[PDB]
Amino acid sequence: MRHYEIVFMVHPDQSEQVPGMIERYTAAITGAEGKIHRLEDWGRRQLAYPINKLHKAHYVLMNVEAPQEVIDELETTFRFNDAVIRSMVMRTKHAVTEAS
Amino acid sequence: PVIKVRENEPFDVALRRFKRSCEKAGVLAEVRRREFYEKPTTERKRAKASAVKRHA
Amino acid sequence: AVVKCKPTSPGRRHVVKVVNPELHKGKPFAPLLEKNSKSGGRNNNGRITTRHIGGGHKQAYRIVDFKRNKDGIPAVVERLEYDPNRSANIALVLYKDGERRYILAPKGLKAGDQIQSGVDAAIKPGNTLPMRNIPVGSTVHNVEMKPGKGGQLARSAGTYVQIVARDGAYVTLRLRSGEMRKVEADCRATLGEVGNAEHMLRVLGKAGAARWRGVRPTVRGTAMNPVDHPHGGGEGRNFGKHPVTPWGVQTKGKKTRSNKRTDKFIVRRRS
Amino acid sequence: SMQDPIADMLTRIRNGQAANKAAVTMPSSKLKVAIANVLKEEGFIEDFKVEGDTKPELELTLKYFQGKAVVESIQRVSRPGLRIYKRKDELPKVMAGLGIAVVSTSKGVMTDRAARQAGLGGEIICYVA
Amino acid sequence: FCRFTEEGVQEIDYKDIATLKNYITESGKIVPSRITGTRAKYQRQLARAIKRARYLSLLPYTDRH
Amino acid sequence: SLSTEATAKIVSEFGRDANDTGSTEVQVALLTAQINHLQGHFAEHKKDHHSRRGLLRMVSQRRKLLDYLKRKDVARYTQLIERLGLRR
RNA sequence: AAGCUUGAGUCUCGUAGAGGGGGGUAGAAUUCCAGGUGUAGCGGUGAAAUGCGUAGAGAUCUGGAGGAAUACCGGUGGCGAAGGCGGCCCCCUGGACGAAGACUGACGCUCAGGUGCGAAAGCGUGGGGAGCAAACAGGAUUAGAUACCCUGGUAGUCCACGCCGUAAACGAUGUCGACUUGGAGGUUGUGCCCUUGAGGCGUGGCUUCCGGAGCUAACGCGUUAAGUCGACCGCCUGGGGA
C-alpha cells in the first residue's frame, strides 16, 4: 500500500463544492482501507499563467496511503470532472505527515 | 526579458539594462541555434569540442 | 485475429479471415431475429435502382438497440454474436429487469462486462449517455443525430466519433470521414469505438466471396456499347470522355450534396 | 576468471620486479608454495611466507641485486590452455643453465637439473631467468 | 556554495516555490548548477520540482503569460 | 522486482531453516517465481526488450542452478522440479 | 568421493539514474482554419527571382484544430549489453551500486553452430501527417548546374503490429580474471569525525583528462592499457579484381 501526494486545483467559482469533493475522496480512500496522512486546502491562489482560461485556481494538497485501484478511480473522477482543472498524483516514499 | 522603465530613469540606461537581460537569457543565441537544424551527432561533436576547449 | 489462408487452391490463396473466437458459435437470440428478405437492389417498381446487389446469402435481421432507452437499468453482456447485417459484431446484453437486447459490440466489451444507459450512467465503453454528459475529447460511437431517434453515426466495424467541443446546446463531432458536425448535446452516444476494427483487414480472396455478401459483378462503362453507358464503344480500348456515371453525371470530383437543410449542422466538410 | 594460479603468481612476481616492490603477496596454493620454495632454493627470491589458516596468503620477498631485478624473466611454459610435459631427455635448460626451469615431477616440484639428476622430468611449470 | 546540502534535505519540494524561484531566473528559465553552485543530484531534483510547479502553475514556464 | 513477503515465503518453503537463502533450490524457486510473475507482464508488453533481457538472464541462471543440482544430487533436483512444475 | 570460502550467485536495507514497455497529461513554439485591427509590401538571398500579397498579404491581437518535438535544467553529467534512451505524472518492469551481516558452496569464465536484441534508411497493412524533407517542380547560380542558395514540395520522418539486420553499429581497441608508480578532476554510494562552518580523514562503484614505468612503426596507450600475464572465442595473410 504505497503513498500518494495528490495536488489538484479546482475552478474558482466551484470553491463552494471543494470541501464536499475532498470529503468524498477521503471516504473513497477509506472505503478500501487506506489512510489520508495530510490534507491542506491552500484555497484560491494566483496562477503563474492561465490554465484553460482563468487566472486564479483553488488548490487542494492531499496526501494518501492507499491501494492502486482507488487511486486509479480518483484519477478517472478527476478526468471526468470539469470542476477540477489540474490534478497531480505523485508517488512518495514515507507518509510525509508534516505541513508544507 | 521583460523590462519596465522606473520613475526618473534615462532611456539609454533602460535600453542597456534590457540588452543585458536579453544576454543573460541567451535569447539571440538560442534563436541562432534554432535557425537551422543541427543533427544530434553534430551537436554532440560541438559539445565535445567545447568541453575540450574548456580543458585549458 | 486476421488469418491469411494457405494457398491450397487459387481463390483460397489471398483470403484473410478475420476470425473472432469469442463470438457465439450457435443460433442467435430468436426473439430479436426478424425476417429480412433481399431486394436485389430493386424498388416497389421492380426496377434495379441500385446495381450490383443480389444473390447473397439468406440473413435474419437482428433487432439491434440503437436507441438505448433502458435508462438506469444496468446490463451484463451475455455473448458477442455474429450479425450478418453489419460489419460490427453485436453484443447480446441481459438487463437486470429481464430484457435481452442486442447492441453494437464496442472495442473493449466482452461477455460478463456491464453496460448502462441514461444520464446517471458511468463513463466507460458500451455505456450510453447524452453528449452533454459525455466529456469533450471522447471517442464515442452509435451517435444519434436527433435526440431519441436512434444512433445513426459510427456503427461500422471500427468506427467512432470524437466529441470535439460543446458550444452551448450543440456538441461538435469530428466524424469518421473528417466532417465536423454540430449535433444536439441531448443526443445519446455510446462510449467507446464500435469493436470489430480488424474487419477491414479481411480480403475476400475470390469473386465468390463478394457474391456471397450480395455483390453482383460490376461491369465497367468502358466495357459496354455507347447505348448503355457514356463510356461506351470504341474499337479496341477507347475512353475519350470525362468519367461520368451511367446517367452522365461526372464521377471524379463533382460534388453531389445539395441539401441546404442540414448545411447549418455541417461545421467543416470532410477532406 | 582466475584460470591459472601459478601463471598469475609468476606475473605478480614479474610485476614486482619491474616496479621495485620489496614484497609480493597472493592467494597461496600447495603447488604455488612448492614453486616458491624451488625459487628460493635456486636463488631468485629471499623468503616466502604462507600467512593465514582459512585464506592463506603467500608473500614472496623479492631480491634486487645492484638496483635491478634478480628475476630477469619468469615465463609459464606449461599453462592451462596448452600443457608442456618434458621427458628427462627432452628436459629444457633456461639460458644454457644460467637460469632454471621449475618442473613438476613424480617426486616433487624441482628445478630441471634436479629432475635430470634423478632420472625424470614432467610438467615444465615455468622458465625463470 | 550548495544550500540544499547544508540544509540536509532528502528531496527538494515543488510546493516550496519561495526556495525554487531563487533558482529560476526572471524569464522563468531554470538557473545552471555551475552558477548557483548546487550539487548535481540536488540540481536535478530542483529542476524536477520546478517542472512540477510549472505543471501545477505555481511557477511560470516563461515570462509571457 | 519480487515482493519481500513472497521471497520470505519461498525461502520458508525451500530453504532448510529461515536464514537458508542461498540454497540452490531456494534460489531456483525465487527465480522461477519471478519468471512466473514476469510472464504476464511480458504477454501484456511484448516489445519491452530490455526487461525481457533480464528475464532471459534469470532463466539462464535458473537453468545453470538446476544443472548444478542435478550432478551433485539428482533426487533433490527431481523433487524440486516436481514442486515447481518445471518441464525439465 | 568428501570438503572449504576468497570466485560466482541468493537474501536484508537503502541508493542514483534520459534503463525498457504501457498509459495519461503540460507549456512554449511552428502550421492551418475562423474572426478582428490595419495597408503595401511581405518573403527570400550574396544579389535576385520563383512564391505569397490590394480578392487585403506580411505585421498585429482573439478563438479553435491538429501533429511533432520537449527550451532552460543539460554537465567529456547519468543510465543502458550494444543500438540507444531527455517535459512532467502514473501503472507494469529490467539491471547497476553501496552498507553491513547471513546463506549456497566453484554453481565459474569463454563460446563454433544456434537464439535474441540491433541507429538510420528501406520495405509490408492500417492509422496519422504540424514541422522538416529524398524524389519532383519552378527560380537562381553556372560555361553547363541533373548540385550547393532560394521558393515550394511528395515518399519518408510520427504511431500501431510485422519484416529488414546493416552503419565510421567506433574507444576504428572481443569477453572475463589477476597484477604494476601517480596526479587532477566528474559522478554516485557508504564508515568514521567537536559538521565548533560551506569542511577533515578514509573506503567502494562507474567515469573524463593528463601523465610514469613499460609497450608501440611512430602516433600514442598508459591502473578503464595499446603495460605485465592467464582462459576462451572472433578475425587477418600484398593491392586491385572484390
Next chain:
RNA sequence: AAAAUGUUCU
C-alpha cells in the same frame, strides 16, 4: 555570389 582544367616520359 561565381574562379573548370593542365598531353606523355624525365
